[PDB]
C-alpha cells in the first residue's frame, strides 16, 4: 500500500506498526522456538515443547535465519500485510556493524521484496520522538544500555557509551535478592513472575542510603503481590535495590560505571561549546528507564557531576517505553523523508 511500516527489532521485544500511528500495533518477544517451530508469544506459551533462541543479543542481530523467521512473523501474522506493498523503516543499535546493516538491507530487498526501506539508529529516533534534533539519549532496554550524544541528527560515534547491563540483568538480580529474602524464584515460570514484580513494584530511590534506613523499620514502603496460585507475598526494599543496580553496577559484580556516569562521560567526549545542549536535552528511552523516580535521580546525579552553572533537564515522557518506535513513526511519515527511502531500483544498482 502507501502506508510505511516501522519495525523496532529489540533484544527482548519487537515493536512493529504503521508510520503515522501513535503507538506500535504489535509488541511481542523477539524469540523463536524450535520443536526440540513458533515465534513471539506463542513460542513462550509453548516453550515446554520447544527450544527458545533469541536472534538479537545486546541489540545486534546474530542469527539471520531466526531473524528472517521473526520478520516473516511480524509481516504476515502480527501486522497481516504483504511486504512487497510497504516501504519499511527498520532500526539498528548504535555502533551496529556496517556488514550487519548491509545484510538487513539485502534480506529486506531480496527475501521480502520490499519496495523501499531505511535503517535508522534507535537512539536518534528516541530524540526525534520529542521533536528535537540535538541532545543526549540514554536508551536502556532488555539486553543493552547506551548513551548517544546527537547534534542536529548526527550521533557522535567517538562519544557513544555502551553499558552491558539492562532489563534482563535487573530481572535476574531481583530474582536473586527475593530468594535471599526467603522466597524461591528459579524456574522459567518464576522468572516471568519476577519480571512482572519488577515492572509493577520497583522504583528508583532519590537517596538510596536513606531509603534503606526508612525500610529498615516502617512498612510504608512495602507492597503486596499476588502470585499465580493466589499466595500474597511482600516486597520491601527489593523494590528499590533492584534498579539501584543501574547506578551501582557493583550490585551484580560489574566493575563498570553506572548510567549517571556513562551519561556524564558521553557528554565529556563532546566539544565544550555543545555540552550545554546535551545537559539541557537528556532524553531517556526504553523499557528499563520506566522506573518511577529514575528521572529525578538522574537529575540529582548529573547535577552533582556537572558545572554548578549548567542547566540540567531530563526528558522522560510517559510513553518513553516506545520512544524509538514512535520516533520512527513520525520520521517515516514526514514528506521530506520520502526522498531518504532506499528504493529497490537504487538497490538493484
Amino acid at each position: 500500500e502507501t502506508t510505511a511500516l516501522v519495525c523496532d527489532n529489540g533484544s527482548g521485544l519487537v515493536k512493529a506498526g504503521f508510520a503515522g500511528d501513535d503507538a506500535p500495533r504489535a509488541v511481542f518477544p523477539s524469540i523463536v522456538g524450535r520443536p526440540r517451530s513458533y515465534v513471539g508469544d506463542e513460542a513462550q506459551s509453548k516453550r515446554g515443547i520447544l527450544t527458545l533462541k533469541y536472534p538479537i543479543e545486546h541489540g545486534i542481530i546474530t542469527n539471520w535465519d531466526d531473524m528472517e523467521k521473526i520478520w516473516h512473523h511480524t509481516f504476515y501474522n502480527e501486522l497481516r500485510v504483504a511486504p512487497e506493498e510497504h516501504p519499511t523503516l527498520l532500526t539498528e543499535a548504535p555502533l551496529n556493524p556496517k556488514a550487519n546493516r548491509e545484510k538487513m538491507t539485502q534480506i529486506m530487498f531480496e527475501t521480502f521484496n520490499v519496495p523501499a526501506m531505511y535503517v535508522a539508529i534507535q537512539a536518534v529516533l528516541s530524540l526525534y520522538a520529542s521533536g528535537r534534533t540535538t541532545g543526549i539519549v540514554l536508551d536502556s532496554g532488555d539486553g543493552v544500555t547506551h548513551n548517544v550524544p546527537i547534534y542536529e541528527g548526527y550521533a557522535l560515534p567517538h562519544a557513544i557509551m555502551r553499558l552491558d547491563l539492562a532489563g534482563r540483568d535487573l530481572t535476574d538480580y531481583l530474582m536473586k535478592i527475593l530468594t535471599e529474602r526467603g522466597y524461591s524464584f528459579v524456574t522459567t515460570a518464576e522468572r516471568e513472575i519476577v519480571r512482572d514484580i519488577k515492572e509493577k513494584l520497583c522504583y528508583v530511590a532519590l537517596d538510596f542510603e536513606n531509603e534503606m534506613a526508612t525500610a529498615a523499620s516502617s512498612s510504608s514502603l512495602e507492597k503486596s503481590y499476588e502470585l499465580p496460585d493466589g499466595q500474597v507475598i511482600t516486597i520491601g526494599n527489593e523494590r528499590f535495590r533492584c534498579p539501584e543496580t543501574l547506578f551501582q553496577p557493583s550490585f551484580i559484580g560489574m566493575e563498570s560505571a553506572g548510567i549517571h556516569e556513562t551519561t556524564y562521560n558521553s557528554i565529556m567526549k563532546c566539544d565544550i561549546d555543545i555540552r550545554k545542549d546535551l545537559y539541557a536535552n537528556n532524553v531517556m528511552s526504553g523499557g528499563t528507564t520506566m522506573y518511577p523516580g529514575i528521572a529525578d535521580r538522574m537529575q540529582k546525579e548529573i547535577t552533582a557531576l556537572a558545572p554548578s552553572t549548567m542547566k540540567i533537564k531530563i526528558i522522560a515522557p510517559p510513553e518513553r517505553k516506545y520512544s524509538v518506535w514512535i520516533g520512527g513513526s513520525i520520521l517515516a511519515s514526514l514528506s521530506t523523508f520520502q526522498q531518504m527511502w532506499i528504493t529497490k531500483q537504487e538497490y538493484d544498482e
Binding site: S130, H158, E261, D271, I272, K276, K311, T336
Partner: protein
C-alpha cells in the same frame, strides 16, 4: 573611487525604506547584539530604540539633510557617559568561546511564546546573536527569522511535536551553517590568518596522519581563504556558498584516506559532512622517528613556505599533543629560527640558536604531554581516577585534601584544553599558567 560623504546615511536609509520599520528594527537588534556580545538585553534594546528613532526621522523624504549627521554624533557622545544606557567595549569585540545560550524545551518555548510573542522574539534574537555573533550577519538574520517562523507555526499546530521535527529537519542546513560559521570564524578571529592557516593544517594532519602533505595543504589553505573572505563579508551568501563547496573538495581528497573520513563523506548533505569532519578527534598517530628542525639553508633560502608547511605537517602527524599546544609553540619557534638569516654571521647564530630551540621545543612537548596525560585515551571519570593515582605517586607527601584540589584543577584544565577543538584565546593564557607548575 572613494565613497561619497553620505555613503553610510544613504545605505541605512535605503534598507529602512526597503525593509520597513519593523523588519529594520529586527535587523538592528541582531546587528547590535552581534556588535556588543556582552551587552545586556536592556542596554542593547535601548541602543536599538535610539538607532531606529533617528533613522526613521533622518531618512524621511524632505527631512533635514544634516539630521543624520548630528543625531548619530550625539548617540556616540551619549555612550561616553560612564554607566550609560548603551553597551560598550573596553572598537573590537572578543569572540565568544563559551556560549551559554540554551534552547528551552518545546513546551517551554510554546508557553513563553504564547504569553508574550514580541518579547519572546526580541529576547531570542538578542540572546542568540550575542552568543553566536561571529557568524556572518546575513546568516544570523536569516536563521533567527526562520527559527521564529518555526516557533510561530509549530506551537499553534494540531501536532506540535510532529511539526517541530519537520521544521527542525528543514532548518538543519541553515542552523548548522550559522552555528559552524560562528565557531570557525571565532577561531579565525582569535588566531588571525597566518596562525589560522597553521592551526588548520595541524588539525588536518592529526585527523588524517596517513595522508601526503599534498592531500591536506590545499584544504588548509582553502578553508583559511574562505574564512578571511566570508567571515566579515557583507555579501548575502559568501559563507553559504563557499562552506558547502569546501566540503566537496575535502571529500574528493580524503574520502579514501581512512575509515573515519570514508564514514563522514557518506553523510547525505554538505553540512552533515562538515559537522562530522569538524567534530572528528585526532586519529591514533602512527609511530615514526623524530623530525628535526629545518636546516639553516632551507630556512634562509627564498621561498621557504613549502619547507615550513612540510615541517609543520611532519611534526603534527607524529606528535601526540593537542592542536592548541602545537600552534602555540610552533609559531614562535619558526619565527625565532628565522631571526638568524638577518645576521652577518648566520651560521654562528644557527649553531647557538638551533640547539637552544630544539631543547625548548622538546621540553614544551614533554610538559604538554604531561598536562594532557591519560585524557584522550580514557572516559572522563576513569581519566580522573588515573590522574589521582599518578599525582599520589608523584606527591606521597600531599594530604588527601591537597591531592583532591590538584586533581580538580588539572582535570578541569584538561577538559578545556586537551581536545582537538579547544578554545584558542582561553587556552593560550591557561597553558601559560599551567606550564609554570611543571
Amino acid at each position: 573611487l572613494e565613497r561619497g560623504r553620505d555613503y553610510e546615511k544613504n545605505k541605512v536609509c535605503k534598507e529602512f525604506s526597503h525593509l520597513g520599520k519593523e523588519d529594520f528594527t529586527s535587523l538592528s537588534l541582531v546587528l547590535y547584539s552581534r556588535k556588543f556580545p556582552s551587552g545586556t538585553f536592556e542596554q542593547v534594546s535601548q541602543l536599538v530604540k535610539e538607532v531606529v528613532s533617528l533613522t526613521e526621522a533622518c531618512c524621511a523624504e524632505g527631512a533635514d539633510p544634516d539630521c543624520y549627521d548630528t543625531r548619530t554624533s550625539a548617540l556616540s557622545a551619549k555612550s561616553c557617559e560612564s554607566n550609560s544606557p548603551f553597551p560598550v567595549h573596553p572598537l573590537k569585540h572578543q569572540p565568544q568561546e563559551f556560549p551559554t545560550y540554551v534552547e528551552p524545551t518545546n513546551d517551554e518555548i510554546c508557553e513563553a511564546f504564547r504569553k508574550d510573542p514580541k518579547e519572546y522574539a526580541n529576547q531570542f534574537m538578542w540572546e542568540y546573536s550575542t552568543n553566536y555573533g561571529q557568524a556572518p550577519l546575513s546568516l544570523l538574520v536569516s536563521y533567527t527569522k526562520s527559527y521564529l517562523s518555526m516557533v510561530g507555526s509549530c506551537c499553534t499546530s494540531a501536532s506540535p511535536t510532529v511539526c517541530f521535527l519537520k521544521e527542525r529537519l528543514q532548518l538543519k542546513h541553515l542552523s548548522l551553517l550559522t552555528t559552524l560559521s560562528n565557531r570557525v570564524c571565532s577561531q579565525y578571529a582569535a588566531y588571525g590568518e597566518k596562525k589560522s592557516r597553521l592551526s588548520n593544517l595541524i588539525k588536518l594532519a592529526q585527523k588524517v596522519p596517513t595522508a601526503d602533505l599534498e592531500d591536506v595543504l590545499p584544504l588548509a589553505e582553502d578553508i583559511t581563504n574562505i574564512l578571511s573572505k566570508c567571515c566579515e563579508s557583507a555579501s548575502e551568501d559568501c559563507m553559504a556558498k563557499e562552506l558547502p563547496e569546501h566540503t566537496v573538495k575535502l571529500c574528493d581528497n580524503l574520502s579514501t584516506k581512512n575509515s573515519k573520513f570514508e564514514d563522514c563523506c557518506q553523510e547525505k548533505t554538505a553540512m552533515d559532512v562538515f559537522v562530522c569532519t569538524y567534530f572528528m578527534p585526532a586519529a591514533q598517530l602512527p609511530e615514526l622517528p623524530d623530525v628535526e628542525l629545518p636546516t639553516n639553508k632551507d630556512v634562509c633560502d627564498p621561498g621557504n613556505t613549502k619547507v615550513m608547511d612540510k615541517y609543520t605537517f611532519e611534526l603534527s602527524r607524529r606528535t601526540h599533543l593537542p592542536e592548541v599546544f602545537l600552534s602555540k609553540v610552533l609559531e614562535p619557534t619558526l619565527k625565532s629560527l628565522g631571526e638568524c638569516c638577518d645576521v652577518e654571521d648566520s651560521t654562528t647564530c644557527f649553531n647557538a640558536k638551533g640547539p637552544l630551540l630544539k631543547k625548548e621545543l622538546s621540553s614544551f612537548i614533554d610538559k604538554g604531554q604531561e598536562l594532557c596525560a591519560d585524557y584522550s585515551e580514557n572516559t572522563f571519570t576513569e581519566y580522573k581516577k588515573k590522574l589521582a593515582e599518578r599525582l599520589k605517586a608523584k606527591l606521597p607527601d600531599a594530604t588527601p585534601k591537597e591531592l583532591a584540589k590538584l586533581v580538580n584543577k588539572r582535570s578541569d584544565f584538561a577538559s578545556n584544553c586537551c581536545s582537538i577543538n579547544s578554545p584558542p584565546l582561553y587556552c593560550d593564557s591557561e597553558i601559560d599558567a599551567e606550564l609554570k607548575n611543571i
